[PDB]
RNA sequence: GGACCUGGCGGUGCUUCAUAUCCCUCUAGAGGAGCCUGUUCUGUAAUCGAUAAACCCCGAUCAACCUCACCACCUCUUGCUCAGCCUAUAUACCGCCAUCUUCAGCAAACCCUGAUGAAGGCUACAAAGUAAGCGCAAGUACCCACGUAAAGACGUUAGGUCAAGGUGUAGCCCAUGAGGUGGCAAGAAAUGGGCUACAUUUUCUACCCCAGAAACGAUAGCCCUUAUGAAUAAGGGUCGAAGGUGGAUUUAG
């Protein structure tokens, strides 16, 4: 009984705001899309399936949104919000001089309602001992204590922390461990002096 | 409305093993410890022997979710091989193809 | 990955340092050995929280106190 | 002889769709996956849950939109969001279509505690790729 | 003809605290379709260059995990079928990047994900020394 | 279980057993043949045990220019609708199963005196 | 909110209303199923716990007078409160807390009619301890749910012993009363309440209708509002704009209010009054009477939420497009062709007459096609209008093809509906222009269509002209078998045939000429 | 829990929204069997 | 038929739409732009381009079909219509006429190409006899008209290189000339730099071959290139390796040494090396094991 | 009973072939001994099924207890199930596959021939075939265009599978259903597939290849240790035989 109006293809003009008609990620909706894009294995004496009943367009991911024009628009909008990097910091040596203590965490992101995942707790940190210890006795002491967390080829000590589930807990525990390690390498023992 | 009575039994076993999980681990540690008194290890053995059945994690089995098939199941997907091959051929799940390597 | 579930503002030292929870036994006995190893494993384990760890501790305390008849 | 997700050849009076016409070894060669999630990829988990919820909602909406569909579903899970995509026929009324859409959306949301949206494409009669 | 007069701009506040400086943002996108990954990384690098930041690119190898099941049900051990998951990696490295820039860029990209992709971030931040040491 | 359930066309296939051994060789069957049935067309999407009135699909959405809401079908109305569905299915099955009277020609079970109607129309168009 | 495909595309206001109402009904059905079977959705699979998604619990607990009283304000009903008052007065005879009694009275006054009478006469048994809060809430209830003498008695009692309490009291007093209004205002301003001007808004609502002797004092009252400096001029301003309603437009006050609302638009708005929904609708109602285009543009951040109901949105858009049509109209049709899919008979009539006065003939076809595509079917008022306006024209020779096409579509729509009986009187009214346009290339169609028309008649002068032009545009017999028959039918075709028969018609055969002579 | 799944879907069928063709077939053959004894 | 023009104009409209979308001058616009745009907007892991999404010119999408061969009524346009092979036979008739005309005066084209140039299916035998007509025509003299007629069908031979490429020499500090090359294998990848002025010792990962290869056949393989060239003790080489198999790394070194020596050595001697067959990566690698059998090729015992 | 059409068959003729297949040929193996694991058979109260090609480390990419479906004993009766059933029927089936296939044919819709019969339709310097569609093929996957995989139609074996699951029919529906203790799963014997060695290309020692010694062999048995479990596996000491390179026949490349 009811009949559907013809699609918006002939209605849409050549001058048109594609970023406005497809701002976010969404399905293909050939009724709204004017392009004759077809996709499918053509049959002998045939051609691919027409865009209307071609659900493979929907099977595949969609990237009609996020065109170069939309990207330029969003970057022009968001450059007001982004900040500037210190021009003085323009080299790895300079950045590690300003802040030798490197620290990095990491976490995956996955599709689905649940978001927690134990690997979120991982964290590690790195620092070169060539400038931090300022002494030799404690240097020998701590390099003897640590088993393999050092690397002299690169001249950096690196340590991992996962004993705590929370990233901030891992961070605080690593900081406390480093502090106590320095404080305990400062001093020594008599059985340690006898070698 | 589980698939069958054996699936019902497996679920009861899993639930019992969970709700007695910590206790089983603790007393098993107290049994397998070496330095503590042998009489204490014997008391712990008696405790484990007096514990109820269907509470240990060994009696359960990694059965299928749908077909209740004990064997021929992948631990990752939890499904039986038949159903896996079925819906993979139908292309229901994602990012899986035939290995024509 | 932790929008919520902050472990009730718990602390790394509250997780790891159990010396305050370890008060009702000397520092040499086999019970001390066992509970020190237990605390080591617990501090190593992040999956559980200070709550579960203290329940574990009270569990062991009560059990070996009602089996305190030996002290051998 | 292997029979797997393929249709027996008839005299030539059998309308068939693309996905069930092509064989299960043309998945990546000449088809796409109906569902799209990362549980299958390495490093992640919950794949069994993804698959079971997929089949559940597929059968659910198939049985709540009887006689109207003309293909399998297409699922698009972008992070927490869920997007269903279907192709149906213009048999019943838009009233019923919208009401059932809202009902299914609400049920899926309250059940899986997930933000869900649904899209459907109308066709006069189900498309046919070949006559087998 | 309908063009708004005054664009509603959200509020922003420059808190007294200093923003944290991320030394290196190394993100790793895993997918099934190399074309999807190419479009995605082109999108990302173009957005980054329009934001005004350096960029590096490299494509780790394609990994595959395959396994064999029975082709039949009851008794056929000679005849099997195989299946495989192909995962494809693409790494995007950014250097000398401020914390707020990281936040805005990662939020943009995280809203702009495609469907069949996982995203693994590694943040490297440089910090001073503690006070107790 | 609900997951164990599956589409009806394969159920009907497996119940009919149209092909696999009974058909081939011409052995056939001793005059028993299950007729396919379509329950999808039988009842509209509205029918259920709890007879809730749905203005979206079951009842017209507007009445006298007044919006409707969910309501209850009492026990008497529910059993009335159930009897109506029972009788309707009965007449459907009756009209389905009936006699077939092809004009007896030379004899019963003989294709002698039967006419197939006029010839078929040609492509160019020639009604015979 | 609406889908994208064209079949589900809601193409009319009433059907779109019904559609999203069906969606809301599905939402309510979802609420019903979840609150009827909570245990099914009880699983908190999602890592972030969300009470918006958790099932909803309106379940009274076990008998516990104190916890039951605390749960009263949680359950939001009246039977529980009746039962709790029963349990506390009959067998217990004690009050859990004065705050609990106050909350019970709040709920019962909000819920309120013999039922309201019973609920109000069952509150005087409450323990002696009845403070201001209790008395003024009783006043609130008796005002907003029952007559006003009870509220006045309660207020006198309170005096013998708040902002919106006195607001309700003023509503009760008001709903001619010059001294009453004056003394009310005076003592209200005398008291130290310092209202939030909702009292003023309510007294304006009551002054919805009055002559200048209260319309003009409203201006000085508003100036006093501004002097004290509280009002944003969101609702009282609009209400006085409405009270301005009118035998003669007041251009001076109109310009004044134009400047006022101009600076109000220039500044940013924040909502404070629940009655800002009638603002939009009645404002545009006054704008329609005013008839100004700079005014319409001025009336045109997130201030678009105040439209709300589809009825008010409909009134606004209707009056807006009507003013724009009755204002060149190229920019108007541009705005229109821009907003037609977003936007939703009278508007199209105004469009048709605007296009007529503009003389832009080529545009009307597309507009009719759009209306037909959306919902223009089974009604011939607009068909008659478009046909008359388009065939008053014949000046485009090449456009006669489009004339024939749109005429054929109009007839395809006209003849759809026999069962309704409405399509029978449509040709008698508008078939003449349709057949003229069909005549203006194809001619046999118009010939047989006029045949059907006359064999259904109501002849007409332009019908005579049509017959004459058709006959003169080669075939004597083909022209005769029409003109002679219509002459034998009616007299004016006969007085025209008197001249038609001169050229070549009468020479063919005399039997039809004999019939003409007999009829003449 | 197939408990939750099946109970929810059974309640929803009784509501009369999800036409479970499997149960329809089953109950049809059940009716026929109880008719034939 | 009018659907063709419908699709053509719709394709132009969609092309303008896409040009406006991507932000370029819609007039100047190309098929490579179209294909890149549709690839970016509609990715696909599909392996076959035929199955990947395509927005192509309709004239090239739809195949050519013979138009109505007869007017509104009555006769057909061509004079062979009542038989098949109308165009084929008309062309053969024209060829026969030209051939007998030349008589009184006195690469090839694939069957599928001929089919898709015409609007009718073809047969192997008629293709063969047509080629026979062509070749027998060309055996004799041919005028300009005949030459152009034949070249209308004749296609490009498209010859290959049949030669081993040459890498460019390089120069590094203290004015040292050299040439670097890379070799591969089953599982071994190596890179070797040949120094011309140098000679004598040879390095591999910082170790000499005499002690890195205890076995003699490996060094025999290493020497085979220089031994064949006669360039033995005037040119030295350094190299780095990453591989599993000994003989694999050996062959990789061989290929890399040859590919680096090809630069310093003359072209004729490069050709001599190619003929010797030491400049080609052997494609042979361990076959896959099949699931049902015991090895890459061996099956379980057929027990009967 | 006479004469024919199609197919199978021929220890049927001519011709051309046979890729690791027919042979001649090439290599390395199985039937020798021990051991691991299945099958047959014996007994037991003790599952089930396939059980030539096209099963025999097969359902099982696992059986100490659940897995278990058997059995003795002990309990439940609307019984988690708007019940349930591993109860019969794979000769009702779907679903999934072996198979000739290491094939290339299968064919809707038309036309023609045989006196308008069963049936056939092949001659290219051309005589009735035209052909939709499927498959082969092509192309895609891996390292190529080759190769390997994948694919491999119509159908034959009422081939295997009601025990993956579901289901038609026939049955138990105080049971032929459900629950919990225990063992059940050994070998007078025969056979299959695989591992070990029977030697000096060997055995041991450090490196994996320029050496030095001997002139062997246990993944079986006994004892011990440990892995996890509440309650088979790896390692260590001892035992140091059979065994002397295979009886017809036979496998893979
Ligand atoms: Mg187990
Ligand atoms: Mg096979
Ligand atoms: Mg008879
Ligand atoms: Mg068992
Ligand atoms: Mg049983
Ligand atoms: Mg069978
Ligand atoms: Mg194969
Ligand atoms: Mg192939
Ligand atoms: Mg059989
Ligand atoms: Mg053990």
UniProtKB/Swiss-Prot annotation, chain C:
It is found in: Mitochondrion. Signal peptide: none annotated. It comes from the Eukaryota. Component of the mitochondrial small ribosomal subunit (mt-SSU). Mature mammalian 55S mitochondrial ribosomes consist of a small (28S) and a large (39S) subunit. The 28S small subunit contains a 12S ribosomal RNA (12S mt-rRNA) and 30 different proteins. The 39S large subunit contains a 16S rRNA (16S mt-rRNA), a copy of mitochondrial valine transfer RNA (mt-tRNA(Val)), which plays an integral structural role, and 52 different proteins. Belongs to the mitochondrion-specific ribosomal protein mS31 family. This is Small ribosomal subunit protein mS31. It comes from Homo sapiens (Human). The chain holds residues 317 to 388 of 395 of the full protein.
Swiss-Prot record, chain D:
Its main location: mitochondrion. One of its GO terms (biological process) is mitochondrial translation. GO terms for molecular function: RNA binding; structural constituent of ribosome. Keywords: Mitochondrion, Ribonucleoprotein, Ribosomal protein, Transit peptide. Transmembrane segments: none annotated. It is found in: Mitochondrion. GO terms for cellular component: mitochondrial inner membrane; mitochondrial small ribosomal subunit; mitochondrion. Component of the mitochondrial small ribosomal subunit (mt-SSU). Mature mammalian 55S mitochondrial ribosomes consist of a small (28S) and a large (39S) subunit. The 28S small subunit contains a 12S ribosomal RNA (12S mt-rRNA) and 30 different proteins. The 39S large subunit contains a 16S rRNA (16S mt-rRNA), a copy of mitochondrial valine transfer RNA (mt-tRNA(Val)), which plays an integral structural role, and 52 different proteins. Belongs to the universal ribosomal protein uS3 family. This is Small ribosomal subunit protein uS3m. The lineage of its organism: Eukaryota, Metazoa, Chordata, Craniata, Vertebrata. The chain holds residues 36 to 167 of 167 of the full protein.
Swiss-Prot record, chain E:
Transmembrane segments: none annotated. The keyword Ribonucleoprotein applies. GO terms for biological process: mitochondrial translation. It is found in: Mitochondrion. Keywords: Mitochondrion, Ribonucleoprotein, Ribosomal protein. It comes from the Eukaryota. One of its GO terms (cellular component) is mitochondrial small ribosomal subunit. Its main location: mitochondrion. Component of the mitochondrial small ribosomal subunit (mt-SSU). Mature mammalian 55S mitochondrial ribosomes consist of a small (28S) and a large (39S) subunit. The 28S small subunit contains a 12S ribosomal RNA (12S mt-rRNA) and 30 different proteins. The 39S large subunit contains a 16S rRNA (16S mt-rRNA), a copy of mitochondrial valine transfer RNA (mt-tRNA(Val)), which plays an integral structural role, and 52 different proteins. Belongs to the universal ribosomal protein uS10 family. This is Small ribosomal subunit protein uS10m. It comes from Homo sapiens. The gene is MRPS10. The chain holds residues 52 to 184 of 201 of the full protein.
Curated annotation (Swiss-Prot), chain G:
The modification N6-acetyllysine is found at residue 39. Its main location: mitochondrion. Abundant in testes, skeletal muscle and heart tissue. It is found in: Mitochondrion. It comes from the Eukaryota. Keywords: Acetylation, Mitochondrion, Primary mitochondrial disease, Repeat, Ribonucleoprotein, Ribosomal protein, RNA-binding, rRNA-binding, Transit peptide, Translation regulation. PPR repeats lie at residues 62-96, 131-161, 162-195, 196-232, 233-273, 276-305, 313-344, 345-378, 427-459. One of its GO terms (molecular function) is RNA binding. The keyword Coiled coil does not apply. The keyword Transit peptide applies. GO terms for biological process: mitochondrial translation; regulation of translation. Disulfide bonds: none annotated. GO terms for cellular component: cytosol; mitochondrial inner membrane; mitochondrial matrix; mitochondrial small ribosomal subunit; mitochondrion; nucleoplasm; plasma membrane. Belongs to the mitochondrion-specific ribosomal protein mS39 family. Mitochondrial RNA-binding protein that has a role in mitochondrial translation. Component of the mitochondrial small ribosomal subunit (mt-SSU). Mature mammalian 55S mitochondrial ribosomes consist of a small (28S) and a large (39S) subunit. The 28S small subunit contains a 12S ribosomal RNA (12S mt-rRNA) and 30 different proteins. The 39S large subunit contains a 16S rRNA (16S mt-rRNA), a copy of mitochondrial valine transfer RNA (mt-tRNA(Val)), which plays an integral structural role, and 52 different proteins. Associated with the 12S mitochondrial rRNA (12S mt-rRNA). This is Small ribosomal subunit protein mS39. The chain holds residues 88 to 668 of 689 of the full protein.
